[PDB]
Amino acid sequence: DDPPPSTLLKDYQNVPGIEKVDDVVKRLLSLEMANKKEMLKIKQEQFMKKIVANPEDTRSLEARIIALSVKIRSYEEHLEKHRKDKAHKRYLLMSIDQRKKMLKNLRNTNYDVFEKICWGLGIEYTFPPLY
Template identity: 35%
Template sequence: MSLRHIKQLSKALILTHIGPKPLATPKRSNIVLKSGKTFPYFSSPCLIQSRTKSTISGSSVKRKPLSFDYSGDLVTRSSLQESDILNRFKDVTELENAPEDVKRICSIGMASGVEIKKHRIEEMSNRLEQLFGKDCHREQMIGKLTVEIRSLIAHCLQFRSDKRSKSILVEKIQKRKKYMKFLRREDYERFEWLLDELKIKYIPPPAYYKFVSKRQKRKIEVKDAAYAVRQSKIDALKKKLEAEKEAFMQEKEEILAEIQKEAEKYELDPELFKQSLIREREKSKRYVLAKDLRTADVEYE
């Protein structure tokens, strides 16, 4: 172990053990160098990164999982068949009669990442050219950015520490939104057609920006959870009422059938019963209305 590596290790150990709370002193063991000098070394250094966010008080808060839902992509990157020929070799007619080894070399399975990305962009370009014609420059740019965004999303979710790719991804998402905004102003039908073909959801920017503090966010989350519980109870009650409604309607039909039989037996007119019921309902409504008016007059006095 060279002296430079020892200095770097000592700096890392000092940085890891500086914090708001005092840390326990670990065991020490001496490293004897070739020159005869000794260097104190911690036997169990804590160099593992944790997915937590430290605060001033010393407590840790778990980070939320990384998500790029704000991009508007409804689908992920599509998979390719490894046996398919690359787009740049499709015009080669001699490849049809070539041996299998030559076809395998020209296939997607033997291509590099740059070649696969170029193949995806060319496939997207040909598809949009068939749909919108040769003069669809803005649609071509949106399609190219869509291919790059979906590739970068898969990369950033796999490699969380690659911050440079994440910043490039955010820039490309904003750039695509700008081109989509321009296309939306020019031709709305074409804009909707492109969104349907690329499986993208356009999320316009808010008209007004208001800063939301952490306390307000917690309040909003609690309210949403309470409304969700309330809605679940309402849905359960609706299902219960629907089940009871079927039994009630069946019982109602049986009672009406019995009333009809008795009316036919005693030769009674059912219309008279209906009119009497209507009169009783109107009388009860008038009684309730008069009662409410009397209580209102008493409160006013």
């Protein structure tokens, strides 16, 4: 599910006094009047809060997996409309491959975080075919 359109942008969510503000400025500063990239940023921020131990550390493998997952969701939403977009088809298939690679590395290094990631993002890890 997407964030509500009334949610404030990530950059305008900790500014002091944002609750003492007129409705019109709230609309101007919401996801209703921004392109899709802020909504994806909000999704990423929510997942980082929900899954990882340190939401601020973005270089960790779990953070990269979450980022690639939101990107993959974006590609699937895009291809649901542009069925003949071969470039974005390539991008989606590749991104799935590297997310599988990151999941393999996380499994081999940190199993607890791997379980948490797989539960939080609804990812079913599958072992590669032998032939």
